[PDB]
Amino acid sequence: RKLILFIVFLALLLDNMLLTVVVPIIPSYLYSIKHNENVQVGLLFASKATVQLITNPFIGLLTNRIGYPIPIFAGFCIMFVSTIMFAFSSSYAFLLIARSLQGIGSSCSSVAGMGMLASVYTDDEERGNVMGIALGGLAMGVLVGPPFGSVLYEFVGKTAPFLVLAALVLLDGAIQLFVLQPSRVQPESQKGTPLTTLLKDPYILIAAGSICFANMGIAMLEPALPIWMMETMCSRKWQLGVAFLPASISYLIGTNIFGILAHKMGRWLCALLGMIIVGVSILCIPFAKNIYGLIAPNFGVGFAIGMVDSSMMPIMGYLVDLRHVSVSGSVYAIADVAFCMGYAIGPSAGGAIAKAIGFPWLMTIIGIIDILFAPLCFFLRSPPAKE
Numbered sequence: 001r002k003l004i005l006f007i008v009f010l011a012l013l014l015d016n017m018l019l020t021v022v023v024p025i026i027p028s029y030l031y032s033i034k035h036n037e038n039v040q041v042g043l044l045f046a047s048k049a050t051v052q053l054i055t056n057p058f059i060g061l062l063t064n065r066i067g068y069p070i071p072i073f074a075g076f077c078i079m080f081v082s083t084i085m086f087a088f089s090s091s092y093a094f095l096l097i098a099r100s101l102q103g104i105g106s107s108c109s110s111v112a113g114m115g116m117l118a119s120v121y122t123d124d125e126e127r128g129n130v131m132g133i134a135l136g137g138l139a140m141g142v143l144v145g146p147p148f149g150s151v152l153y154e155f156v157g158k159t160a161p162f163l164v165l166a167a168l169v170l171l172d173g174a175i176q177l178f179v180l181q182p183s184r185v186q187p188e189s190q191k192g193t194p195l196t197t198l199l200k201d202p203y204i205l206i207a208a209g210s211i212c213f214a215n216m217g218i219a220m221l222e223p224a225l226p227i228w229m230m231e232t233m234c235s236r237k238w239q240l241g242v243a244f245l246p247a248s249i250s251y252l253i254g255t256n257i258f259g260i261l262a263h264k265m266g267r268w269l270c271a272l273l274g275m276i277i278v279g280v281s282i283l284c285i286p287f288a289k290n291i292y293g294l295i296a297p298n299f300g301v302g303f304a305i306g307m308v309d310s311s312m313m314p315i316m317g318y319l320v321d322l323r324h325v326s327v328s329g330s331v332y333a334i335a336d337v338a339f340c341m342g343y344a345i346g347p348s349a350g351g352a353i354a355k356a357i358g359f360p361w362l363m364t365i366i367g368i369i370d371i372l373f374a375p376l377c378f379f380l381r382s383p384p385a386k387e
């Protein structure tokens with residue numbers, strides 16, 4: 001069980017690291033190779049999220065039939081294929097294919113690893129701690145990703161970060177042989193309430209929408225910032241990923257503080273404050289004209305997003321416990337749908353908005369939306385039960 005937890009933690013870490021390594025590399029690479037680009041990069045970045053969203057229903061149907069280890073190993077293989085294609089491709093179509101494949105492997109590994117964790121551990125006190133440790137590998141991967149890719153892209157070329165990540169994925173796949181023996185076919189049983197029934201509830205809609213908008217505020221920022229940083233003639237040496245580093249660190253700091261402070265303060269008020277701070281900070285991003293000017297707004301963005309998430313995940317758990325037949329994975333299913341929809345709508349519309357009216361107005365619109373959604377958290381002050 002320790003090895004399974006480590007395997008799932010490392011799988012999520014490598015998935016998010018591969019998702020975030022391309023942020024400083026590909027936009028600058030496609031920007032340089034040219035010398036409508038915004039829309040192309042937006043579609044390239046949103047393809048992974050939309051493919052993962054589409055694939056999610058068809059992975060549960062596979063785990064319900066052949067168990068967890070086979071889709072886990074298939075996810076690892078797809079991750080290695082995507083990593084190699086990222087490493088060696090130099091064309092837009094191949095990069096799009098590599099991004100799309102990452103969605104299939106990410107869905108496979110996330111759904112099957114989380115199910116395996118939620119089913120192996122029988123004691124709910126142990127299961128909660130285990131799933132907290134494993135799900136924390138996503139934010140650690142997001143933190144590690146950008147600076148590593150930026151430094152290796154500046155100093156030892158574009159292929160090196162992806163080759164190193166491919167080696168890590170190979171090591172994880174070799175660990176799978178020692179631990180799981182993916183040839184094992186296992187049964188599975190379905191419990192709880194179907195997701196489509198939960199999404200019909202307006203309160204779960206409020207919480208999921210808050211999370212979706214809070215994370216879309218940076219889903220749009222991921223492909224657009226490395227192109228807007230060309231206004232400062234910014235180099236890649238300790239700059240293109242270190243620009244995103246403060247948000248990654250502040251997310252961890254804010255989650256650590258407010259996962260404790262929210263229960264005392266109130267999760268609805270905590271989420272409302274987080275939404276307001278997110279809006280204000282992404283409004284304050286465009287006015288910076290130096291790399292040192294992005295430290296405060298990115299820190300605010302990460303801190304407030306961590307505040308919103310720490311306030312909203314227990315809120316969703318409490319809501320599904322009150323209103324429907326809850327299971328250990330319902331909160332993760334709702335949050336994953338919210339994240340996928342946010343990261344799919346973000347870049348796709350952000351590219352068009354940036355082309356039409358520019359990046360500062362894109363950030364202004366997103367900040368206004370994130371501020372205006374905050375008052376809807378008042379409906380979560382005391383939600384009633386249903387017959």
Ligand SMILES: COC(=O)[C@H]1[C@H]2C[C@@H]3c4[nH]c5cc(OC)ccc5c4CCN3C[C@H]2C[C@@H](OC(=O)c2cc(OC)c(OC)c(OC)c2)[C@@H]1OC
Nearest residue numbers: 020023135138139142146244248251305313332335336339
């Ligand atoms: C698509 O998403 C991700 O890439 C992950 C991150 C999303 C977002 C983010 N992206 C960035 C990209 C950057 O590029 C340079 C820089 C900074 C950021 C930040 C800072 C803010 N934030 C950090 C990451 C959050 C992660 O999600 C969880 O940690 C999580 C935890 C849970 O429980 C503890 C869950 O279960 C309820 C759960 O359910 C889905 C998810 C999420 O994985 C699903």
